[PDB]
Amino acid sequence: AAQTNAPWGLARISSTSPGTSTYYYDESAGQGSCVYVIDTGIEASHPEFEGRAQMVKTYYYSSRDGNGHGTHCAGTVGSRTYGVAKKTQLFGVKVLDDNGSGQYSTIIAGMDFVASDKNNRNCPKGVVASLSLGGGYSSSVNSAAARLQSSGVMVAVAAGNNNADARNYSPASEPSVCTVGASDRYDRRSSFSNYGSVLDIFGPGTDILSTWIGGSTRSISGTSMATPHVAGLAAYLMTLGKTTAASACRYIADTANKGDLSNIPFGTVNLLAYNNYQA
């Protein structure tokens, strides 16, 4: 399949080169997989989700995304126009309030919720969780992310936006999950992206067009935007049978565009997520 005039990040993850605008992908498009978006919620009624999104848990008075951030991330995972895996099922877990923040105890509960809740969902091709959130180092937050991954979910987490070593942030610093840095359309490390030996992969994170609340769209930037590119890629690859939840981060790193990013500090991977779709 080919989607012309796609957001640059979609075009980038199916290309060996920057500077193109068509997204190429196998038409299976993540069908039969599931992605949990653990964030501010998802505006499921948005036509862009085509009925494939649903809120399954909130820790607040409502399950509505009153912020937009979670809707944007979900759109990069799986919206029809802005998504990597255009046929995946999306499940929203609202651990962040409408101001975009959440207590670590609530975030931990949401991770353990996903580890159990996947047993209530039909995901024959596998389960992914996208965590575009984080704060300072916490062994408890890291151990929750580790449990979620151990339970058979491909966990993708944002590296953080501190232009610093991700070793000091959680869940970014949990070794066993897939820690995602951000790049721009000219293949630079995004100026704000964290780095370090704990990063597994980079994805597009600067000026990313996706869905927003009120049935809308907008472009925003962050490692929060890179993470759902990787989560959607994992779902896509698991539907194709190329990898599994336990192995997807390594598979993505193995098959990435290698050595192509600029402003990568010594000791940080120079790997950019790539679907290696070759019609």
175 is in an annotated binding site: yes
Tell me if 268 contacts Ca ion by CB under 5 A: no
Q: From the candidates 97, 170, 224, 229, which is the catalytic residue?
A: 224
Q: Is 97 a catalytic residue?
A: no
Tell me if 170 contacts Ca ion by CB under 5 A: no
Whose tokens are 């929203």? That residue is 92
| DSSP secondary structure string for all residues of 77-90 | HH-TTT-SSTT-EE
Contacts of 266 (CB under 8 A, 6+ apart): none
Q: Is 69 a catalytic residue?
A: yes
Tell me if 200 contacts Ca ion by CB under 5 A: yes
Tell me if 98 contacts Ca ion by CB under 5 A: no
Total number of residues binding Ca ion (CB under 5 A)?
Answer: 1
16 is in an annotated binding site: yes
Contacts of 169 (CB under 8 A, 6+ apart): 134, 135, 136, 137, 159, 160, 162, 194
Nearer to Ca ion, 95 or 180 (CB): 180
Tell me if 165 contacts Ca ion by CB under 5 A: no
Nearer to Ca ion, 65 or 200 (CB): 200
Q: Name the minimum Å distance from CB 157 to Ca ion.
A: 9
- Both tokens of 178, joined, read 């897939």
- Both tokens of 95, joined, read 């651990």
Q: Name the minimum Å distance from CB 209 to Ca ion.
A: 28
26 is in an annotated binding site: no
What are the C-alpha distances in Å from 191 to residues 23, 36, 155, 209?
Answer: 25, 28, 24, 18
Q: From the candidates 15, 39, 79, 210, which is the catalytic residue?
A: 39
165 is in an annotated binding site: no
Q: Is 224 a catalytic residue?
A: yes
> Which of 214, 203, 177 lies closest to 261 in space, CA to CA?
203
Peptide bond into 7 cis (omega under 30): no
Tell me if 48 contacts Ca ion by CB under 5 A: no
Nearer to Ca ion, 43 or 200 (CB): 200
Give the pairing of strands 89-94 and 53-58.
parallel
Binding residues for Ca(2+) are: 16, 175, 177, 200, 260
Q: Summarize as ranges the residues that interact with Ca ion (CB under 5 A).
A: 200
Residues with active-site annotation = 39, 69, 224
